[PDB]
Design a protein around this ligand. Structure first.
Ligand SMILES: CCc1c(N2CC[C@H](O)C2=O)cccc1S(=O)(=O)N[C@@H](CNC(=O)c1ccc(Cl)s1)C(=O)OCCc1nccn1C
Ligand SMILES: [Ca+2]
Lengths: 234, 50
């Protein structure tokens, strides 16, 4: 995350971190339930083997609430396109269930019609992860959060040099130097409604990070709610 | 109606035959008022563990 604030105790408890063979966080995820993590399909090509760490806020300390989980099954969308990052969504079933506690809790899955009409017409959502704090920088050792304005489809399509599909939306600032960045991919985009946080996006991609006239690009979770629901029963 | 302050619903608002219907995510139960969403467990989804 470029700019924004540290996640304080209990603020981003749905944050999951995908860790590689050598125990390096490469992608984020969102805790949906005790068995299921939401992430980006493109994250599956970042490592040959990986596990999921939950309740981690500092990757250079043992705060004591951290736990690592083996992935039983990977459910990748069959229409994922590496060329465009279209259908950039995967669901992970864990071998062992997560135990909810301090800094370990699931984000709510919204209903599509309400999410699109009510959540994604709010001013801002919140993105989080251990991604880079500068475009050509190193990944954060602290979990960070950033409030990101929703961007209308039209302005976003105008902004992009790459294809913006119907499975994507855009969030962040035009000029202001705050954005998601490399390593944040697969992590949560959530929208607060009356003090409850609903998953509204997956960190997918961007033309570097925090660039003028450029936005963060998020998988439109609302379009995959039935797909997520179907994945979570197998 | 769901446009008017989410029809007074805590969470999901749906307009069915001219009237508001409220519902709640998994781990929540709709209260007697048919609007508020009550957690069923200590770690309901979408709540900061503050
Ligand atoms: C041109 C965009 C792009 C593509 N894509 C996407 C489809 C299109 O066809 C194309 O070319 C592919 C690779 C690199 C880049 S990039 O170098 O311009 N930007 C990086 C860094 N920025 C961000 O991660 C974000 C900024 C805001 C939000 Cl929101 S994510 C990125 O998107 O890495 C994603 C891959 C990844 N995830 C974890 C590790 N890694 C390496
Ligand atoms: Ca730690």
């Amino acid at each position: 995350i470029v700019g924004g604030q540290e996640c304080k105790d209990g603020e981003c408890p749905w944050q999951a971190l995908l860790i590689n063979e050598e125990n390096e966080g490469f992608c984020g995820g969102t805790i949906l339930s005790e068995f299921y993590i939401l992430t980006a399909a493109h994250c599956l090509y970042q490592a040959k083997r990986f596990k999921v760490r939950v309740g981690d806020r500092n990757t250079e300390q043992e705060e004591g609430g951290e736990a690592v989980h083996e992935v039983e099954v990977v459910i990748k969308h069959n229409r994922f396109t590496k060329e465009t990052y279209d259908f950039d969504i995967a669901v992970l079933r864990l071998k062992t269930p997560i135990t909810f506690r301090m800094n370990v809790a699931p984000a709510c899955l919204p209903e599509r019609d309400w999410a699109e009409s009510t959540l994604m017409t709010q001013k801002t959502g919140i993105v989080s992860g251990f991604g880079r704090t500068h475009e050509k920088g190193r990944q954060s050792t602290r979990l960070k959060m950033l409030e990101v304005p929703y961007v209308d489809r039209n302005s976003c399509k105008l902004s992009s040099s790459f294809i913006i599909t119907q499975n994507m939306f855009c969030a962040g600032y035009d000029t202001k130097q705050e954005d998601a960045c490399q390593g944040d991919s697969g992590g949560p985009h959530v929208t607060r409604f009356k003090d409850t946080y609903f998953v509204t996006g997956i960190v997918s991609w961007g033309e570097g990070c925090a660039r003028k006239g450029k936005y963060g690009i998020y998988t439109k979770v609302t379009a995959f709610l039935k797909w997520i629901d179907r994945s979570m029963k197998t | 109606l769901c446009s008017l302050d989410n029809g007074d619903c805590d969470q999901f608002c749906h307009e069915e035959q001219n009237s508001v219907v409220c519902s709640c995510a998994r781990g929540y139960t709709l209260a007697d008022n048919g609007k508020a969403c009550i957690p069923t467990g200590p770690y309901p989804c979408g709540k900061q563990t503050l």
